[PDB]
């Protein structure tokens, strides 16, 4: 395509580039469980800090 | 205790570990020895017993694969194809055996799901071994052709890998008979008859006939015309072979 | 428990070279053509019954070491002496596969099932090579019926794609001298046999016979075609070669 | 990684950037999904394949010569991961 | 630095014998990929295409 | 079209852009503001913006 409201598409994509950045199922689950585990602990430590 | 965790790895490999076990109607037996562990891991290790019973349904076939050569040429394809499957199980188990060494698979809810992908494969491969006993073609073709009509598109792929190997001698008899004018029979695992009726001076006299007991069923009933073309003329495939 | 596997993996590797174990000893029963192995008692009975699964690989290896001794003892100049030269090649490439396993134990590790699935590609090749060698052990054959025997086995194996390739390398090194003495008959009608290595034996017009101690290639009639070419010189797909080779030298 | 692999396209193809772009895409796809070795590490197996290659071609002298060259490569003590280098040169003979 | 030059000379000799048709520049790049733990199987395939 | 398409790409690259801001940036590129400058500019403005939010 040529964009309908784009016209320096190379530069727009370029800006996005510079700002860039079994056992399969247990890897995905293990991350989900470990991320919730991190959260519960950050709320508690924060409350611990006010005291 | 941890010795018990080791002991089950060998029930996949064999039928027997540290304790003497046996297979009867189904299932590798369990002794968990002395009480000193929960009455509830023996149930975990019963789910796992059917995979040792299912291993030994492929293992006898592979003992029959490793022969001088005899029991079909079709009949030695079903077993040879099932051997390419036997070796994939082993690599899952040796990586599973590599977790058990201390560093894991000390846990038991994880031996359960590490064998579940092997389980879906191997019971339908065991069921396919009950489904076979013929060692001539035209009914071994009727075995793998019937498991590709039944649903569950997870097991349909598995049984398609054996179909192309079970068919592979059946087609090696077809194109060669065009070329040489020879027909391969050791036990009659080719679906044409060969000297059904004594030879006569040619007039297209029967000396090849299709048979109504044994026909490849990958072919509808079109194989009838196919074999009288080729046989008269000297003297995967569903209709994509003339 | 993981320790009793490790040293028996090492003992198993020592046997497969063809060399006595630490806890696996070799007892001849038939004169080491098949070895009646005895592994001696180990404390853990689980690891001992799994070790037994891997010892028939070594029994089938003794079958091939007597094949390459056997044809040398007779000093053939036949194609049986050359069939063994192939089995020495399959035997040289084998040794790289054991020695790797050996290398893997030095640093890093191989458990018993780590052993098991690496042996597993070659116990099947061994057993196909072992059965060609035991069928041949009758103190026979001389040239042409060695060839006849190896062709029937290739036409047996048909439909297991595995032995088609393995029997392919054996049947062409066996044919490497045979198509020499074949040409000598179809272009000159002369013989080149050190022994009797060519089916049409001799003793103008000449007194040709054939013997069924040197059975024709698959079919008796194409051997009869070469009977009929050579007189005129004096005045699957391989037997096929002959029928038009006759009829361009007729 | 990203640079070195692009360099590979550039020297062979003898073109700079915006010329080698599609080729880059094949290369990136094919290297990335199979990044790490799929063979068990072992210098000796690769070496044997190179010498059998010499014998098969009846270049016996060079097969012996090679044996001297591999010891020289090993001895310097600079490049480790040697099997993969050797492996590559054997595949492309 | 010097050992790194001597080693490259050995490798160039390994290349001539096997008829790879890799230059001093092409070999040096290949080495560098190889040292980062890339699978040689994949690497050989890419090369063949790049010569096309 | 292009903007929905770009909003997915922005997300796969995890850049930090929402739909509203992206739209303003596109008009900046078309007015010939360099990508390198514009990336600089986004970063500085965000840093200050967040510092102000934590005070509120």
Short mmCIF file of N, CA and C in Angstrom, two decimals, chain B residues 3 6-7 9-10 13-14 16-18 65-69 73 76-77 80 83-84 86-88 90-91 93-94 97-98 101 165 168-169 172-173 176 179-180 182 184, chain C residues 1-2 5 44-47 49-50 53 109 111-114 116-117 120-121 123-125 127-128 131 134 153 155-162 164 218-219 236-237 240:
data_model
loop_
_atom_site.label_atom_id
_atom_site.label_comp_id
_atom_site.label_asym_id
_atom_site.label_seq_id
_atom_site.Cartn_x
_atom_site.Cartn_y
_atom_site.Cartn_z
N UNK B 3 13.85 -43.82 46.13
CA UNK B 3 14.06 -45.04 45.43
C UNK B 3 12.87 -45.56 44.61
N UNK B 6 12.60 -43.66 41.28
CA UNK B 6 13.50 -44.22 40.29
C UNK B 6 12.98 -45.41 39.64
N UNK B 7 12.19 -46.19 40.42
CA UNK B 7 11.81 -47.49 40.19
C UNK B 7 10.83 -47.53 39.07
N UNK B 9 10.64 -45.42 36.32
CA UNK B 9 11.33 -45.02 35.09
C UNK B 9 11.62 -46.28 34.30
N UNK B 10 11.88 -47.40 34.98
CA UNK B 10 12.29 -48.65 34.50
C UNK B 10 11.06 -49.48 34.07
N UNK B 13 10.68 -48.72 30.63
CA UNK B 13 11.78 -49.25 29.84
C UNK B 13 11.74 -50.68 29.52
N UNK B 14 10.88 -51.36 30.29
CA UNK B 14 10.83 -52.74 30.49
C UNK B 14 9.47 -53.03 30.92
N UNK B 16 9.85 -54.22 34.39
CA UNK B 16 10.39 -54.65 35.71
C UNK B 16 11.47 -53.72 36.14
N UNK B 17 11.47 -53.45 37.49
CA UNK B 17 12.34 -52.56 38.20
C UNK B 17 13.00 -53.39 39.37
N UNK B 18 13.15 -52.64 40.51
CA UNK B 18 13.69 -53.15 41.80
C UNK B 18 12.87 -54.24 42.44
N UNK B 65 10.46 -57.95 14.43
CA UNK B 65 10.93 -57.08 13.36
C UNK B 65 12.39 -57.60 12.99
N UNK B 66 13.10 -58.06 14.06
CA UNK B 66 14.44 -58.41 14.16
C UNK B 66 14.63 -59.90 14.07
N UNK B 67 14.27 -60.41 12.88
CA UNK B 67 14.18 -61.71 12.30
C UNK B 67 15.01 -61.79 11.06
N UNK B 68 15.31 -63.03 10.69
CA UNK B 68 16.05 -63.18 9.42
C UNK B 68 15.28 -62.72 8.19
N UNK B 69 13.98 -63.07 8.02
CA UNK B 69 12.98 -62.34 7.28
C UNK B 69 11.96 -63.37 6.98
N UNK B 73 5.61 -59.44 3.93
CA UNK B 73 6.60 -58.42 3.50
C UNK B 73 5.90 -57.07 3.79
N UNK B 76 6.14 -57.31 7.82
CA UNK B 76 7.40 -56.88 8.35
C UNK B 76 7.59 -55.41 8.08
N UNK B 77 6.51 -54.76 7.62
CA UNK B 77 6.50 -53.33 7.46
C UNK B 77 5.77 -52.62 8.55
N UNK B 80 8.18 -52.72 11.32
CA UNK B 80 9.36 -51.88 11.07
C UNK B 80 9.02 -50.42 11.20
N UNK B 83 8.72 -49.46 14.79
CA UNK B 83 10.06 -49.37 15.41
C UNK B 83 10.64 -48.01 15.30
N UNK B 84 10.20 -47.26 14.26
CA UNK B 84 10.59 -45.90 14.16
C UNK B 84 9.82 -45.14 15.24
N UNK B 86 9.19 -46.64 18.24
CA UNK B 86 9.55 -47.18 19.51
C UNK B 86 10.69 -46.36 20.08
N UNK B 87 11.56 -45.87 19.15
CA UNK B 87 12.78 -45.13 19.46
C UNK B 87 12.54 -43.71 19.91
N UNK B 88 11.36 -43.12 19.53
CA UNK B 88 10.94 -41.71 19.95
C UNK B 88 10.50 -41.68 21.36
N UNK B 90 11.94 -43.47 23.60
CA UNK B 90 13.06 -43.66 24.44
C UNK B 90 13.75 -42.43 24.73
N UNK B 91 13.81 -41.55 23.74
CA UNK B 91 14.40 -40.24 23.95
C UNK B 91 13.68 -39.24 24.88
N UNK B 93 12.04 -40.43 27.53
CA UNK B 93 12.26 -41.11 28.78
C UNK B 93 13.69 -40.89 29.24
N UNK B 94 14.72 -40.71 28.35
CA UNK B 94 16.08 -40.59 28.75
C UNK B 94 16.33 -39.11 29.15
N UNK B 97 14.68 -39.16 32.50
CA UNK B 97 15.61 -39.85 33.35
C UNK B 97 16.76 -38.93 33.74
N UNK B 98 16.99 -37.88 32.85
CA UNK B 98 18.00 -36.89 33.15
C UNK B 98 17.58 -35.76 34.12
N UNK B 101 17.85 -37.18 38.40
CA UNK B 101 19.19 -37.05 39.04
C UNK B 101 19.09 -35.70 39.77
N UNK B 165 3.93 -46.86 5.10
CA UNK B 165 4.96 -47.88 5.26
C UNK B 165 4.38 -49.26 5.07
N UNK B 168 4.01 -49.54 1.51
CA UNK B 168 5.20 -49.42 0.70
C UNK B 168 5.67 -50.68 0.02
N UNK B 169 5.56 -51.88 0.58
CA UNK B 169 5.78 -53.13 -0.24
C UNK B 169 4.69 -53.41 -1.18
N UNK B 172 5.46 -51.74 -4.15
CA UNK B 172 6.68 -52.27 -4.78
C UNK B 172 6.44 -53.54 -5.60
N UNK B 173 5.33 -54.22 -5.37
CA UNK B 173 4.83 -55.32 -6.17
C UNK B 173 4.09 -54.87 -7.46
N UNK B 176 6.96 -53.04 -10.41
CA UNK B 176 7.86 -54.00 -10.84
C UNK B 176 7.33 -55.05 -11.79
N UNK B 179 7.41 -54.06 -15.17
CA UNK B 179 8.74 -53.95 -15.72
C UNK B 179 9.32 -55.30 -16.14
N UNK B 180 9.23 -56.28 -15.23
CA UNK B 180 9.96 -57.56 -15.28
C UNK B 180 9.08 -58.61 -15.74
N UNK B 182 7.34 -60.29 -13.10
CA UNK B 182 7.56 -61.19 -11.97
C UNK B 182 6.57 -60.73 -10.91
N UNK B 184 5.92 -60.89 -6.68
CA UNK B 184 6.57 -61.21 -5.40
C UNK B 184 5.49 -61.79 -4.52
N UNK C 1 22.76 -45.93 43.59
CA UNK C 1 21.72 -46.16 42.48
C UNK C 1 22.22 -45.40 41.23
N UNK C 2 22.57 -44.10 41.05
CA UNK C 2 22.94 -43.61 39.71
C UNK C 2 24.37 -44.02 39.37
N UNK C 5 24.63 -47.72 37.53
CA UNK C 5 24.48 -47.57 36.10
C UNK C 5 25.78 -47.11 35.38
N UNK C 44 22.16 -53.88 43.25
CA UNK C 44 20.93 -53.40 42.65
C UNK C 44 20.53 -54.23 41.47
N UNK C 45 19.40 -54.95 41.61
CA UNK C 45 18.91 -55.94 40.68
C UNK C 45 18.20 -55.27 39.52
N UNK C 46 17.77 -53.99 39.67
CA UNK C 46 17.03 -53.26 38.63
C UNK C 46 17.98 -53.05 37.48
N UNK C 47 19.21 -52.52 37.77
CA UNK C 47 20.24 -52.09 36.79
C UNK C 47 20.85 -53.30 36.07
N UNK C 49 19.04 -56.25 35.29
CA UNK C 49 18.16 -56.71 34.24
C UNK C 49 18.13 -55.77 33.02
N UNK C 50 18.42 -54.44 33.10
CA UNK C 50 18.48 -53.51 32.02
C UNK C 50 19.73 -53.67 31.27
N UNK C 53 19.75 -56.15 28.36
CA UNK C 53 19.16 -55.77 27.12
C UNK C 53 20.19 -55.35 26.10
N UNK C 109 28.37 -36.90 30.91
CA UNK C 109 27.91 -38.20 31.32
C UNK C 109 26.91 -38.83 30.40
N UNK C 111 24.24 -41.86 31.38
CA UNK C 111 23.40 -42.87 32.11
C UNK C 111 23.02 -44.04 31.17
N UNK C 112 22.28 -45.04 31.76
CA UNK C 112 22.00 -46.25 31.03
C UNK C 112 21.08 -46.07 29.87
N UNK C 113 20.14 -45.05 29.92
CA UNK C 113 19.12 -44.83 28.90
C UNK C 113 19.67 -43.88 27.89
N UNK C 114 20.61 -43.05 28.30
CA UNK C 114 21.51 -42.23 27.47
C UNK C 114 22.35 -43.12 26.63
N UNK C 116 21.30 -46.27 25.83
CA UNK C 116 20.37 -47.16 25.21
C UNK C 116 19.85 -46.68 23.84
N UNK C 117 19.50 -45.37 23.82
CA UNK C 117 19.01 -44.74 22.63
C UNK C 117 20.12 -44.31 21.71
N UNK C 120 20.93 -47.71 19.80
CA UNK C 120 19.73 -48.20 19.21
C UNK C 120 19.68 -48.08 17.69
N UNK C 121 20.23 -47.05 17.05
CA UNK C 121 20.51 -47.07 15.62
C UNK C 121 21.40 -48.16 14.99
N UNK C 123 22.18 -51.71 16.56
CA UNK C 123 21.91 -53.07 16.99
C UNK C 123 21.02 -53.62 15.90
N UNK C 124 20.33 -52.81 15.09
CA UNK C 124 19.51 -53.23 14.05
C UNK C 124 20.24 -53.52 12.81
N UNK C 125 21.33 -52.76 12.61
CA UNK C 125 22.22 -53.02 11.44
C UNK C 125 23.07 -54.26 11.63
N UNK C 127 22.27 -56.86 13.40
CA UNK C 127 21.47 -58.07 13.35
C UNK C 127 21.12 -58.50 11.88
N UNK C 128 21.12 -57.54 10.88
CA UNK C 128 20.98 -57.81 9.51
C UNK C 128 22.23 -58.30 8.86
N UNK C 131 22.84 -62.03 10.29
CA UNK C 131 22.08 -63.09 9.64
C UNK C 131 22.50 -63.41 8.23
N UNK C 134 25.66 -65.79 9.17
CA UNK C 134 25.32 -67.11 9.67
C UNK C 134 24.70 -68.00 8.67
N UNK C 153 18.25 -62.20 -0.52
CA UNK C 153 18.04 -61.56 0.72
C UNK C 153 17.62 -60.07 0.58
N UNK C 155 15.84 -59.01 -2.08
CA UNK C 155 14.47 -59.17 -2.55
C UNK C 155 13.52 -59.64 -1.48
N UNK C 156 14.11 -60.13 -0.35
CA UNK C 156 13.32 -60.43 0.88
C UNK C 156 12.98 -59.29 1.68
N UNK C 157 13.95 -58.42 1.85
CA UNK C 157 13.95 -57.31 2.78
C UNK C 157 13.04 -56.21 2.29
N UNK C 158 12.54 -56.40 1.05
CA UNK C 158 11.81 -55.44 0.25
C UNK C 158 10.57 -54.93 1.00
N UNK C 159 10.59 -53.62 1.26
CA UNK C 159 9.47 -52.96 1.90
C UNK C 159 9.80 -52.41 3.29
N UNK C 160 10.93 -52.81 3.91
CA UNK C 160 11.64 -52.25 5.01
C UNK C 160 12.74 -51.53 4.31
N UNK C 161 12.77 -50.19 4.37
CA UNK C 161 13.52 -49.29 3.48
C UNK C 161 14.94 -49.32 4.07
N UNK C 162 15.03 -49.89 5.32
CA UNK C 162 16.28 -49.94 6.04
C UNK C 162 17.33 -50.84 5.47
N UNK C 164 17.37 -52.03 2.54
CA UNK C 164 17.56 -51.92 1.12
C UNK C 164 18.87 -51.24 0.79
N UNK C 218 19.58 -64.86 -11.00
CA UNK C 218 18.26 -65.03 -10.38
C UNK C 218 17.53 -65.97 -11.18
N UNK C 219 18.02 -66.20 -12.41
CA UNK C 219 17.34 -66.87 -13.47
C UNK C 219 18.40 -67.67 -14.28
N UNK C 236 15.62 -58.17 -11.32
CA UNK C 236 15.18 -56.77 -11.16
C UNK C 236 15.64 -56.10 -12.44
N UNK C 237 17.00 -55.95 -12.77
CA UNK C 237 17.55 -55.11 -13.79
C UNK C 237 18.94 -55.56 -14.14
N UNK C 240 18.83 -58.61 -16.86
CA UNK C 240 18.37 -57.93 -18.05
C UNK C 240 19.35 -57.39 -19.02
#
